[PDB]
């Protein structure tokens, strides 16, 4: 039940 944080908005920006 964690909240979206700026790192989640950055880690998913360019990955895989």
């Amino acid at each position: 039940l964690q909240k979206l944080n700026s790192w989640d908005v950055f880690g998913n920006w360019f990955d895989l």
Partner: antibody
Amino acid sequence: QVQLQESGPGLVKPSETLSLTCAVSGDSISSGNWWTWIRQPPGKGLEWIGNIGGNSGTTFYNPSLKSRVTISRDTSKNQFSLKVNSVTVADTAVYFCARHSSGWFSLYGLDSWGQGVVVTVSS
Amino acid sequence: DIQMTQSPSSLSASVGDRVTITCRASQDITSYLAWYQQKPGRAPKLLIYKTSTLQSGVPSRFSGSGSGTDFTLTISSLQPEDFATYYCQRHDTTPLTFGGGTTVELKR
């Protein structure tokens, strides 16, 4: 530059599993956008269901529905899906799928939407 | 969790009037608020993000303001194609809740 289109059954039965899909063209699913599912009961306002990161794969849901919701993704087909299990009659609504644009460290807005899909839950 | 209220729930005004809608949260959300316009039976249209940052292609008469737990969407010189329902949205952390909505009439 981006166009979304819902697809799925417009009629399900109570307690069944609803399955909807949102095709995306003009951009990649695997990217920094957060693909979100919205719903609006007939004659009511908007209700943010959940979203999912194209690359992170993590999901976020509405706390009033996290038990019954499941968001997924399909990179090859440029699609992302939503599943609502154990549906009830009170879920009949228009289900939008939109692209929640994002910044480097700050979300932005849902700048591209689909026309929507009507789905009724009735016996 | 979060509770987003809009006010007035609906108002009527004539073309050429300066209109203003208010959207209040139940907790601080910095300058992360998004406004949307929805025509009847159609999908919403992203108007504003980041409190007052106007989305490309939106007319200049749309202006956002406020910070924290009290935001404002103002339309200078209201136009006919602006009569619709307007929603606000928290866009910083989950659950990105939408406001209750505000409908705009044409006073007659």
